[PDB]
Symmetry: C2
Subunit: 318 residues, 2 copies
């Protein structure tokens, strides 16, 4: 467990930009005369916020949030502590923190909603949208067996559950293609940067692997935190030159949502190693680190977890 | 026009948090078995990202975007130049950059959309939504007479129009009450900070004034860039102790959307001053600064404009 770094942070640079997007001509952009109903919008683009420390390490880390959340995932924790974005910067890595296509600062297309409101299209054509309620999220994140009872050993700062709920947002995943548009945008970003470590989480767990299969250029390594899906053993050949780290927390066994995902990720990692690649499945409890939730980047020992990941990145980007 | 500050930037502090929110009960959170349809969500909270320079000035600046955009408004310009967030930090001001309630990283509620999809609610229950197309935005922002023709003297980096379109997003304003939930959240933020300058734009132009009418505590000064509405002249009384700066750019008179707004804001400022307040309407062309678009924080002379505003803030704080 590292001491939290104190004092100021100096950055060589910072900024924001977007990757990708497609232009759509719509007839239903507006219900009022203040904004034209017929017009062209850009959709599917990906917001990127970058921060560059002094004398940055060769490969930036791109941080990719999962469901029901935005790039806030990686920023100050719900209880006010340093997050992984700031910690990584303090450790000398440039960071590229995205909002997935159709999430956060990355535009959606509202045309179908307005078409239904205007009586031009049926309710069945509304987009497939969802939001994770507090009670559902408690169990998905493995804070305890069922809301509102927490595991006594959880690392998540459950006293700050209200703040976690504040950062959760509706999810448009189901209304976009698969692979999600973020996947192609991550390839464009990796190529632009000429080498980045892709770090994903949960719903976006599979994204970096899909990006690498589409085009391996610029993908230095992949870190996936509790992915919803790992690649199939049959997907390893295109990945054998990209080191992979998959990280799982605690209280996995008692949740049917999660136990099979850990097992499947082992099948992937083992297949990857057998094919001549380099994969590791880091199960925190096996390292003597207990109680981590699905939101391990926000947990009370989040910097201990970050150090394990950064140590691995340093050994596999060498 | 100032030289663009060079070299690294040092942060004493940085972070993110949310203000506000309300918990609601839904029965339409999901149409799938992966997520429960019945549950509680938090909506109307406001995302806030802050950066604190060393030896920060006493009063932070809170930057509040307008329609069809997010806090990206204030970040790197579309053509890659320093934005006002970074420039203000380099000038010694702590900055708080928000996403309005129901925009960007600030959650919307999808329950009504899903209720309509499930047949539980009529289609009129759908939220009132809009997005500004490229063609519409060109005119709203006053880049030229019609898309994609630019005024010869525009300060906007029109070569980066595709990048500007990338930062534009759907707007849920019309589906929230008025005053928008952002207004009460700005009051909470101002009180938390114990004094901030509120700087708003266009759709949010009126917000700081609505905030101050709700509760003046913590509102040190107000800067409104090309507001869509200014307070009525009859409503100036509650604002007479808060210095106010309203800024307008160029090519106003040829756009019927904008000519009346400049006029109405003069009526407000004059009424405010007549009532004992302190208001200024800064028209850039009257200062010899020509060609600014509605997106003046992203224009090629954006640091010249920033310096005019910061000089005013310094004199009124």
């Amino acid at each position: 467990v590292p001491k939290t770094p104190a004092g100021p942070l100096t950055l060589s640079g910072q900024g924001s930009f977007f990757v990708g997007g497609r232009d759509v001509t719509s007839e239903t952009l507006s219900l009022s005369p203040k904004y034209d109903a017929h017009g062209t919008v850009t959709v599917d683009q990906m917001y990127v916020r970058y921060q560059i420390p002094q004398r940055a390490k060769r490969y930036p880390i791109t941080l990719i949030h999962g469901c029901c959340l935005t790039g806030m995932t990686w920023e100050t924790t719900p209880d006010g502590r340093m997050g992984w974005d700031e910690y990584f910067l303090r450790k000398g890595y440039s960071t590229y923190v995205i909002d997935q296509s159709g999430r956060g600062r990355s535009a959606t297309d509202i045309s179908a909603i307005n078409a239904v409101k205007l009586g031009k299209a049926p309710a069945s054509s509304l987009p497939d949208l969802f939001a994770a309620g507090h009670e559902a999220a408690w169990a998905i994140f493995r804070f305890g067996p069922r809301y509102p009872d927490a595991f006594k050993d959880t690392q998540f700062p459950v006293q700050a559950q209200a703040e976690l709920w504040q950062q959760m947002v509706p999810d448009w995943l189901g209304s976009m293609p698969t692979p999600n548009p973020t996947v192609a945008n991550l390839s464009k970003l990796a190529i632009k940067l000429d080498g980045t470590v892709l770090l994903s989480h949960s719903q976006s767990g599979i994204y970096p692997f899909q990006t690498a299969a589409m085009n391996p250029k610029g993908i230095t390594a992949i870190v996936s935190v509790e992915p919803g899906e790992c690649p199939k053993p049959e997907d390893v050949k295109p990945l054998t030159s990209i080191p992979v780290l998959v990280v799982f927390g605690d209280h996995i066994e008692e949740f049917p949502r999660w136990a099979p995902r850990l097992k499947a990720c082992h099948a992937f990692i083992d297949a990857l190693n057998a094919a001549g690649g380099k994969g590791q499945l880091m199960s925190l409890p096996a390292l003597g680190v207990h109680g981590n939730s699905h939101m391990m980047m926000q947990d009370r020992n989040n910097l201990q977890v970050a150090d394990l990941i950064l140590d691995w990145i340093g050994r596999n980007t060498a």
